[model samples]
Target: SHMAMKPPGAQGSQSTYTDLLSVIEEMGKEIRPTYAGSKSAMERLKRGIIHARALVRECLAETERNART
Candidate 1:
């Protein structure tokens, strides 16, 4: 719960991304309710959710960049 309070790129945020990615991967396999019209659409949403790890990684990288400048 404490981890949820911190910004993505702040201190102690490094390990959070790993945990987040793992949870997303696990949930991706378990979740399948057909929100859209077909299975493919649901797959796309899962992929997008998993792909969000990149966004968190980039946020940390940019935070480091800004700190250095």
Candidate 2:
């Protein structure tokens, strides 16, 4: 299997990247708009909007290029 280039990568803060991922997921765990909007639709999007900016670079910082094709 080929490695993920960015958004998920291999290096320092990789786990930290996961932290934000976890934060979104855990935050999703909290939101319960009657499960009407797929459990945590509202907040998770905002969370992504927030972290996606940071993660873009951190992920880019820890980015890579693998060839297996």
Alpha-carbon lDDT, every model:
0.61, 0.60
Q: lDDT of model 1 at residue 59? A: 67
- Going through the candidates in the order shown, the clash numbers are 0, 0
Deviation from native of the Cα of residue 45 in model 2, angstroms: 5.8
Which residue ranges in model 2 land beyond 4 Å of their true spot?
A: 1-13, 33-45, 65-69
Residue range 5-61, candidate 1, lDDT tens digits: 656653555664656556566556545554535677577667756667565676687
Clashing residue pairs, candidate 2? none
lDDT of 2: 0.60
Model 2 Cα lDDT, one tens digit per residue, 1-69: 765665444344557667666666655654675256753566665666677667766666545542223
